[PDB]
Structures are given as C-alpha cells and as structure tokens.
Design an enzyme around this catalytic site. Structure first.
Site, mmCIF file in Angstrom:
data_model
loop_
_atom_site.group_PDB
_atom_site.id
_atom_site.type_symbol
_atom_site.label_atom_id
_atom_site.label_comp_id
_atom_site.label_asym_id
_atom_site.label_seq_id
_atom_site.Cartn_x
_atom_site.Cartn_y
_atom_site.Cartn_z
ATOM 1 N N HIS B 463 -58.511 124.750 18.252
ATOM 2 C CA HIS B 463 -59.020 123.495 17.829
ATOM 3 C C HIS B 463 -58.068 122.346 18.182
ATOM 4 C CE1 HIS B 463 -61.467 120.890 15.358
ATOM 5 N NE2 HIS B 463 -60.409 120.511 14.651
HETATM 6 C C1 LIG Z 1 -49.738 115.776 13.545
HETATM 7 C C2 LIG Z 1 -50.462 117.105 13.376
HETATM 8 C C3 LIG Z 1 -51.197 117.636 14.448
HETATM 9 C C4 LIG Z 1 -51.919 118.847 14.273
HETATM 10 N N1 LIG Z 1 -52.640 119.394 15.336
HETATM 11 C C5 LIG Z 1 -53.354 120.597 15.197
HETATM 12 C C6 LIG Z 1 -54.117 121.112 16.249
HETATM 13 O O1 LIG Z 1 -54.180 120.561 17.358
HETATM 14 N N2 LIG Z 1 -54.810 122.260 16.043
HETATM 15 C C7 LIG Z 1 -54.742 122.946 14.825
HETATM 16 O O2 LIG Z 1 -55.373 123.988 14.647
HETATM 17 N N3 LIG Z 1 -53.989 122.473 13.783
HETATM 18 C C8 LIG Z 1 -53.313 121.287 13.953
HETATM 19 N N4 LIG Z 1 -52.573 120.764 12.898
HETATM 20 C C9 LIG Z 1 -52.525 121.541 11.649
HETATM 21 C C10 LIG Z 1 -53.726 121.317 10.785
HETATM 22 O O3 LIG Z 1 -53.840 119.933 10.538
HETATM 23 C C11 LIG Z 1 -53.517 122.083 9.477
HETATM 24 O O4 LIG Z 1 -53.139 123.458 9.690
HETATM 25 C C12 LIG Z 1 -54.785 122.043 8.632
HETATM 26 O O5 LIG Z 1 -55.215 120.700 8.333
HETATM 27 C C13 LIG Z 1 -54.567 122.840 7.350
HETATM 28 O O6 LIG Z 1 -55.722 122.673 6.539
HETATM 29 P P1 LIG Z 1 -55.545 122.875 4.951
HETATM 30 O O7 LIG Z 1 -56.893 123.011 4.397
HETATM 31 O O8 LIG Z 1 -54.475 123.887 4.605
HETATM 32 O O9 LIG Z 1 -54.918 121.540 4.463
HETATM 33 P P2 LIG Z 1 -55.329 120.071 4.772
HETATM 34 O O10 LIG Z 1 -56.340 119.884 5.864
HETATM 35 O O11 LIG Z 1 -54.032 119.364 5.012
HETATM 36 O O12 LIG Z 1 -55.953 119.460 3.425
HETATM 37 C C14 LIG Z 1 -55.194 119.207 2.276
HETATM 38 C C15 LIG Z 1 -55.940 118.098 1.526
HETATM 39 O O13 LIG Z 1 -55.468 118.098 0.192
HETATM 40 C C16 LIG Z 1 -55.327 116.797 -0.315
HETATM 41 N N5 LIG Z 1 -54.383 116.912 -1.440
HETATM 42 C C17 LIG Z 1 -53.029 117.235 -1.389
HETATM 43 N N6 LIG Z 1 -52.571 117.284 -2.674
HETATM 44 C C18 LIG Z 1 -53.617 117.032 -3.543
HETATM 45 C C19 LIG Z 1 -53.774 116.993 -4.958
HETATM 46 N N7 LIG Z 1 -52.826 117.436 -5.793
HETATM 47 N N8 LIG Z 1 -55.013 116.717 -5.500
HETATM 48 C C20 LIG Z 1 -56.129 116.468 -4.733
HETATM 49 N N9 LIG Z 1 -55.976 116.519 -3.362
HETATM 50 C C21 LIG Z 1 -54.759 116.796 -2.763
HETATM 51 C C22 LIG Z 1 -54.827 116.045 0.878
HETATM 52 O O14 LIG Z 1 -55.113 114.692 0.658
HETATM 53 C C23 LIG Z 1 -55.580 116.712 2.019
HETATM 54 O O15 LIG Z 1 -56.749 115.999 2.305
HETATM 55 C C24 LIG Z 1 -51.858 119.548 13.047
HETATM 56 C C25 LIG Z 1 -51.109 118.985 11.971
HETATM 57 C C26 LIG Z 1 -50.441 117.773 12.162
HETATM 58 C C27 LIG Z 1 -49.646 117.231 11.002
#
Ligand SMILES: Cc1cc2nc3c(=O)[nH]c(=O)nc-3n(C[C@H](O)[C@H](O)[C@H](O)COP(=O)(O)OP(=O)(O)OC[C@H]3O[C@@H](n4cnc5c(N)ncnc54)[C@H](O)[C@@H]3O)c2cc1C
Ligand SMILES: Cc1cc2nc3c(=O)[nH]c(=O)nc-3n(C[C@H](O)[C@H](O)[C@H](O)COP(=O)(O)OP(=O)(O)OC[C@H]3O[C@@H](n4cnc5c(N)ncnc54)[C@H](O)[C@@H]3O)c2cc1C
Ligand SMILES: [Cl-]
Ligand SMILES: [Cl-]
Ligand SMILES: [Cl-]
Ligand SMILES: [Cl-]
Ligand code: NA
Ligand code: NA
Lengths: 487, 490
Positions: B463
């Site tokens: 992705h």
């Molecule tokens: C700059 C960058 C580039 C990236 N590029 C890629 C890529 O090309 N391909 C890829 O596969 N991955 C990529 N990633 C990684 C990817 O973004 C993450 O692995 C993914 O978003 C993880 O999803 P998640 O559901 O664990 O957390 P997240 O998508 O981070 O969601 C966490 C959510 O929780 C919310 N939150 C946090 N604390 C609280 C709270 N206490 N109460 C209510 N809400 C809260 C936040 O606001 C956020 O919206 C990249 C990351 C970064 C930083």
C-alpha cells in the site's frame, strides 16, 4: 452513558477495518473514537488514521510530485524541448492540492459513519476506565471534562504509533514527519535524521521541491541506510540518492540543536561536525502510542519495547481487550493492521478463528527510484537454511541511457533455499518495483521455486521480466558463509 | 575457400527465436551452428535484421517511442503537483527521438555482431536463406531464387525462424500507404495520420503520433468492426477506447478504407466504404502480420503450410519433414518474442539435449503499450464461459489517487480476475492503467502455479499501489452460469 458490542479506540487503518466488519458483516453495535475528524494540526492523525492523514496517502502524492523533477529533465532525451530556466516547483500548490485530496477522504469517512447503522463515531480522547468502560475526554489530560462513557463487552485498542524524538538538547527545534506535511514553504536547507524509509522518502520529496541554492542532507548514526533491506539495494539507493544531489552522512548523529539569530538551526553532531539548516526533521523511529490510554486502570501488559503485548490472535492479558496495528510494535504497515482487524473480528464475532500471517509480507519504499521487497534478505536466510542461493541481475535500463539518468540501475535479486529451489525473498530497486512486487507476494504464498519463475514466459520489454530470466545463482551461502561456488 | 560449409544446425532467421536456438545449441550442447539473416543492422531496405523484428522494428524501438510519447502526459500532469513552466515553449522533437532510437538499436546490432566472433560453433551468414534440399540451405543475394549464390550450408537439422511481415490490403492507391516498418523512419512527424487496424500495433502507434504531432494535427484510428482490440477483455476494450478519445485520438469504428488517392497538394485522400472521406499526411496500415514463408522455397522439400499460411508444426515444433523445424511467428500462433524464444530453447533441449520439452502456449502474460497500457494473462471471460459451467468475474475500476490531482481523471485503472467458480482457480487476469505490463509478469507465475482467488485475496496488499486491488477482491461482481451472464447465482 451508552452500551456497545465493540468500542474501538482509534479510527485508523486497523480500527476502521475492525469496526466496519463488525457493524456490517455481523451486525454488532460499534463505537469508534478519534481525537479529530479532519487532518492536520494540532493532532495530525485523525479520522482515517495515520495512513490517510499524515502517512501513506499524502506521502505518495508528494513523492509522485517529486518524480516530475526527473521526468522534466529526462524528457529531453526523447525529443522534448522547453524553456528549462522557466521551471519552478511550487510547494504551496502541492500542499494545497494534497490537503484537498486528504480532506475529500476525511469527508468520505464521515459520510460512511452517517450512512452505516450500528457504527457510531465519537470525537475526543478515549481511555480505559474499567474492564468494560471506555471514557472519552475533552483532551488527552486524564483529568479533562468527560464527554461520554461507553460500556463495551469488547474493547479494541488501535491508537497506532507516534514519531520518536531523541532526548538531546534542542530537540524542540526539530520537527517530525507530522509537521513536514504542513510546512508553509519548502525548506532551502534541510537535514532528515534517520536511515529508514520515512527519512529516505522525505529527503527525495524535499530534494525535488527545494528553492534555488537548496541542499538536502540525510544523516544516519550507523554505516548504511535502510537496515533490514537487501544489502545490494541499500548500497544502490544510497548511490542513486547521491547522484540526485542528496548528501548522505553516515556514522553521524545529532548531539544538539540550537537557534540561530535568523531563525535557522545549528546542528552539532556527536563527531563535532556542524551543519546550519532551515529544518531538522527527526525520523529515527515511531513508537507505540500507549500513554493516553490509562492502561494501568485495568492492567493491560506491555512488552519491554512499549508495545501492548498480544498473542497470535491479538488478545491482551485482559479478557475482551484486544490490540491490532502499530500499537503492537510488530510490522508497521497499513495492510497488516487492516488484516489484523479483519482476522480479529472474524475470530470474535463469527466463528473460524483466524490469525494474520506476518511472514512474506510484501512492502515498498517510495524512494526515488523506489524499492519493492517480499520475504527474507539473504543474511537472515543464511542463518536458517544450510544452503542459500542468490540470483541477481543489475543494469541500467535502455530508456535511462536515452534519458541521461545513467546512474538509474534496476536491481532484481531472488533468494532461495538452494536445497529445494524454494523462493525465500525477492528484492527489487527501480521504476515500478512497488507494483511488480505485489503479485510476487502471491507467488510466495504458493511456495514458488526459482524454476517456476524461470519457466514462466516473460512479458517483453519490461523490467519485471528479469525475474523470469534468472537460471544461475551469482553466489551462495553455505552454513552462513558467503561463497561464489557450491562446495 | 570456394567450398560449402557444414553444420549440425542451420537456422534461417537471426531474430528472437533463431538466435535463442542457435546460441543454446552452440554454447550449451557444443553444436556447430550457422545463422542466416538479410541485414546486419536495422532500417531500409529490409527493416528487420540481425536480432529480429523485436530488436529492429518491433518491441524495442516501439517501447522507446511510447516512453517518449508519455512525456506529453507527464508535462501536462506535472502542473497539478505545482510544476510551473512556459507551456507555450513546449515542442516535441520527433527527429531527436528517431535519432536517439536509431542509435540505441544500432548498439544492439553491433553487440550481436561481436557475439558471433567469439562464440565457437556459432557462425553468421549474410543473405537470403532458402531450402534447396533436406540437408542444404542455400544463401542467395536477394529473395529472388534466381539471384546469385553466396554460400551453400550443409545441415543435419534446419530451423525455419523467418518471422512475419505486415499485410497490405489490395485497395486502389495502396502504394500511397505505409506499414509499421516505414513508421519507424518517417523524416517528419505527420500532422494528420490515419492508423488502419484495431490491433495493438495500430493503437500503440496512434499514441506515439498523438504525442509528437505538430501544432494543427490529428490522429485518427479506424477499424472495420465495432470495437478495437479483439481478443482482449471487453471492459478494457471499451475503457481503452474512451481513454484514447479523452487524449484527442479519433476512433472511427465500423469503417474501412475503400481507396486512397493524392490531393493536388500531395496529401492523401482516403475514401471509406461508407463514402465518408478523410485527408491525411500519412496512412499507416496495421491490419495484421502474416508468416514469412514465400522466400523459403518450401516446395523444394515439401514442408507443409497450414490453411492460414503458417508452417504447420506439432507441439515439438516439428514439420512434416523429419529434420526441419519451425518456431516463432512463422508458425502463425502467438506472435510474441518470449514465446519464440521459449520455443527455440525447448526445441534445442529436445533435439540436442535429450530432455524433451514443449512450449506451453496457455496462460502467457502479454502487454499492450497503449497510453494508458494493458497487461493481460489467461482467458477472457466469454471464452472461459464456453469452457466452464460456472465462471466468476471479480472487477474493480478506480481512479488512482494521483489522478485526482494530475488533471487526468479519465485515467481509470481496471483490474479483472476471471475464475472457475467451482474450485476458485484463476483463469485470466486483465489490467488497464499505468504499471499494468509490470504487474502482470508475476501474475503469469501465479497462473502457472494454479493460483485460486483466495491465494490472491489472502496475500497482504502493498500500500498504496494499483496492484493491491488484485489482492482485495473477495466477492464476484457477476457470474456466467452455463454460458449465461447474471449478477447472482440462481
Ligand atoms: C510518514 C509515514 C509514511 C507511511 N507510509 C506507509 C506506506 O507507504 N505503506 C504502509 O503500509 N504503511 C505506511 N505507514 C505506516 C502506516 O501509516 C501505519 O502502519 C498504519 O497507519 C497503522 O494503522 P493503525 O490502525 O495501527 O494506526 P493508525 O492508522 O495510526 O490510527 C490510529 C488512530 O488513533 C487515533 N488516536 C490515537 N490515540 C487516541 C486516543 N487515545 N483516543 C482516540 N483516538 C486516538 C489517532 O488520531 C489515529 O487516527 C507510514 C507511516 C508514516 C508515519
Ligand atoms: C510493430 C511491432 C511491435 C511489437 N511489439 C511486441 C511487444 O511489445 N512484445 C512482444 O513480445 N512482441 C512484440 N512484437 C512481436 C515480435 O516482434 C515477434 O513475435 C517476434 O520478433 C517473433 O520472433 P521470430 O524469431 O519469429 O521472428 P523475427 O524476430 O522476426 O526474426 C525473423 C528474422 O528472419 C529474417 N529473415 C526473414 N526471411 C529470411 C530469409 N529467407 N533468409 C534469411 N533471413 C530471413 C528477418 O530479417 C528477421 O531478422 C511486435 C512486433 C511488431 C511488428
Ligand atoms: Cl540515526
Ligand atoms: Cl549498518
Ligand atoms: Cl520534429
Ligand atoms: Cl481494419
Ligand atoms: Na452510524
Ligand atoms: Na489481501
């Protein structure tokens, strides 16, 4: 107070998947909490998660923008003529179109909640009050005004990760990737600190958009950027970043940062070297986002690195509390967090337990040129298999002798268990690598052998066809030792 | 000396198939090999040369020219990402393109040249090969069997690998038209051009001329039936029609040229069978390619041709004459370079390696370098539906994210997977949009390993990419049940 079958803390990749599946495949009552509904300052991540707001999606748009720097220059080789002196890169226009695109996705997810019954959205900060109560508060202060209290029979923790900032003096003069997405203007001189994909991807973005007289420097404390990737590839991408004007400082680490009278930053390295820059962007790591959750209130256990500890099915130590995605500190990728969220909801609300397979996951780095990889690099394969073969092809594609970008070598490497020909990893560097590698991940699920690749008919002319033209190992590992002939 | 030379194998045609066979017979099995071709380097008068059609007037230079044509989209699309430059100053210099292309091709020509000098048992002979008898290939100064003899090559085995040639329809004023061979050498980009045909060559050339046309120009493509690119996925056929139109190309379907003459200013006046007319500077005919068998004097030894005109072969590339084989476009099957190459390798393993081996012609991946391009492998649905009682079609069509900003919103990406629904086996995968030729290669490997739709869907996506759509499709969009299209199973 309000009741639910599932309360999801964090409306990101993993949590929207988990919640969406529960509300729609199994008709459960779902609550989802996030701190913000649309991207940007002050909390950056938002509805849709890191990927959508400050991650994969806007980075991809900005890398695509940065690629035009090469395209415009490479067009002359194919006959294209224009006034090169008139060319400018307008960063504000980029950022404004990027923000509009991300805002469209935000509005689309809001519509998804308004349209899907049994899936509700709650704005503010969620935290664990007891085993089956989530409190949402006005702010992250465990002490601010309560907004809602949600009892839940199941609790999903999916709050992701956050940039790690080293504890050096002057750290508050540095930004992270979060702020990088919103810079009013493109920095003229910029230092990206770190060797991983975020530091590399932004160095190429800034390199393409810097104003006249710009310079991008990337530093990394060890000897070779992109630890964990193929070694030939780490060397080659290092070489192609340098050829595009980026300066790579290996074995260097910032010791402190200070303010110069003009507003720029003065960086002192541990080695004593110094650099003046407009922006210092730390990209040394992302850490699991667990602080705000009040996890002590129920005893949810952490690993020594700070991830919520989980078993193979994503269950914490406390019954009915789960954790998926970056907060578990395993593979930090969007599709992996999505797959965890789907496998979890299948296990808990349907019935066929499912566990996410974390091996052979294909991934990409949107460097210029980009990298696509799936499975083991050869130094890890050499420690588990007695005989390992490496098939390698590398060369500048003919289009890049015409364009004048002769430094642009395509690299394709296939790593095998030489005992039965099993493909253990495939590593690619060059235009189209991220796209080529996807179906290679399917091949690895089918236990392809090198002969299955080599017996497949090539699509000609492509870079990919190189993967179907390698018959003879370039070298081997026997019992961990690298050699050119099998003994 | 003035004596004939002897070989284990003489190959007539030093192109994709013949060079693979020859090189492999010499270097792998220590045979003594001769290869014959008409020209050592590209261009008029004979166009194809050492290295084949692919190298000289096919795959290789067309890909360089489609790459040049893509900068027209890149220049325009850059503005949406904030690139600013003097749009008015933009010119497409066709002569620079053609010069750069000729130089790349000639470098390949020159490197084949030195392979022959240093490979023991692999010799090159210049001129026209024909069969004098079962064990003697004669090489003559021209395609005319009366032209002088240059050499006589004795051979235990003879490989016919002489490829194919553009077909010219017999319409009045056909001499005012050209083929793809001449298109590679035109001194000036045409202001107005008609490409006749609905196959890949007409479409790819339409794209190239569309990018390099001078200020008032127009590309028109015409095709006698109702929808271009027969043989490809129907959705992708219709979508590629729309995207070509969106880029200013005029697609005239159900139209066919009846005749061509010169207007008084030297331009071509084309009259269609409908009585519609069109004035153009160039008419490029690309209605098909036919096997090149006329010059071989096959009658001397009695090699049989199919009804269609190709050299008839069995699965092992053998003709009806024991020691004479044929591979590549001359057998009028799948006209693709890696297929010719694979046939050549299998033939040599069989004949000289004692490891019998036949080319698999099913599930071959292939690409069209249209703008935007196609990548495809396996059966299209309506063929699958005649062979399998229950067929599922998974289909996704989306504007990739970049084109929400680029200006080119019409650039829909299409991904279709066709399966045997009884057991989930993937029967075909069809793709339209940027990267499709690259994505499809490893799909070929999956199909050769009998992948099912769940092998796709269980693979974790990379992705953000377009390719990840292939691994996110879990529910059919529709079905064919005993040949009948329907959105649900009954
Ligand atoms: C700059 C960058 C580039 C990236 N590029 C890629 C890529 O090309 N391909 C890829 O596969 N991955 C990529 N990633 C990684 C990817 O973004 C993450 O692995 C993914 O978003 C993880 O999803 P998640 O559901 O664990 O957390 P997240 O998508 O981070 O969601 C966490 C959510 O929780 C919310 N939150 C946090 N604390 C609280 C709270 N206490 N109460 C209510 N809400 C809260 C936040 O606001 C956020 O919206 C990249 C990351 C970064 C930083
Ligand atoms: C415009 C165009 C674009 C193409 N694009 C693609 C593509 O993108 N991908 C792909 O896979 N395929 C492509 N093809 C098809 C590919 O070029 C052919 O399938 C392939 O070259 C067939 O190889 P072959 O060995 O049969 O014949 P060739 O490569 O044609 O070799 C035949 C050789 O025989 C020589 N010859 C002919 N008669 C004699 C004689 N009597 N004596 C001595 N020598 C003789 C010719 O000079 C020629 O060099 C394209 C073709 C064309 C025309
Ligand atoms: Cl570092
Ligand atoms: Cl290192
Ligand atoms: Cl010109
Ligand atoms: Cl036609
Ligand atoms: Na709702
Ligand atoms: Na998947």
């Amino acid at each position: 107070s309000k009741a639910f079958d599932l309360v999801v803390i964090g409306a990101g990749s993993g949590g929207l998947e988990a919640g969406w599946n529960a509300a729609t495949l199994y008709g459960k009552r779902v609550a989802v909490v996030d701190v913000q509904t649309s991207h940007g300052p002050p909390f950056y991540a938002a509805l849709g998660g890191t990927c959508v707001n400050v991650g994969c999606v806007p980075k991809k748009l900005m890398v695509t923008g940065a690629q035009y720097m090469d395209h415009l220059r490479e067009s002359a080789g194919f006959g294209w003529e224009f006034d090169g002196s008139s060319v400018k890169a307008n960063w504000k226009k980029l950022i404004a179109a990027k923000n509009e695109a991300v805002l469209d996705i935000n509005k689309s997810y809001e519509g998804m909640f308004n349209d899907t019954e049994g899936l509700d959205f709650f704005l503010g900060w969620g935290s664990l009050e007891s085993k089956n109560v989530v409190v949402v508060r006005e702010t992250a202060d465990p002490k601010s005004a309560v907004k809602e209290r949600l009892q839940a029979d199941h609790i999903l923790l999916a709050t992701g990760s956050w940039p790690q900032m080293p504890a050096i003096p002057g750290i508050e003069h540095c930004i992270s990737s979060n702020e990088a997405f919103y810079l009013p203007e493109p920095p003229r001189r910029v230092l990206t600190v770190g060797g991983g994909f975020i530091s590399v991807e932004f160095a190429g973005i800034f390199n393409a958009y810097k104003p006249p007289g710009g310079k991008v420097t990337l530093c990394y404390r060890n000897n070779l950027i992109l630890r964990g990737f193929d070694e030939t590839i780490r060397e080659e991408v290092t070489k192609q970043l340098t050829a595009n004007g980026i300066e790579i400082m290996t074995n260097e680490n910032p010791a402190k940062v200070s303010l110069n009278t003009d507003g720029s930053k003065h960086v002192t390295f541990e080695s004593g070297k110094t650099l003046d820059v407009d922006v210092v962007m730390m990209a040394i790591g992302r850490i699991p986002r667990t602080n705000d959750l009040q996890l002590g209130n129920v005893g949810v256990k952490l690993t020594p690195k700070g991830g919520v500890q989980v078993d193979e099915f994503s269950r914490t130590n406390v019954p009915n509390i789960y954790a998926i995605g970056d907060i578990t500190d395993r593979l930090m990728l969007t599709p992996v967090a999505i797959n965890e969220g789907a496998a979890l909801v299948d296990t808990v609300f349907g019935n066929k337990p499912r566990k996410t397979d974390h091996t052979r996951v294909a991934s990409a780095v949107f460097s210029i040129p980009p990298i696509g990889t799936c499975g083991l690099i050869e130094e890890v394969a050499a420690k588990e298999f007695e005989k390992v073969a490496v098939y390698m092809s590398s060369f500048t594609p003919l289009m890049h002798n015409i364009s004048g970008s002769k430094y642009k070598k395509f690299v394709a490497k296939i790593v095998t268990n030489h005992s039965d020909g099993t493909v253990l990893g495939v590593h690619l560097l060059g235009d189209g690598a991220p796209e080529i590698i996807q179906a290679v991940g399917v091949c690895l699920r089918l236990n392809a052998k090198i002969s299955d690749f080599y017996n497949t008919i090539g699509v000609h002319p492509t870079s990919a066809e190189e993967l179907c033209s390698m018959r003879t190992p370039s070298y081997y590992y026997v019992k961990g030792e690298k050699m050119e002939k099998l003994p």
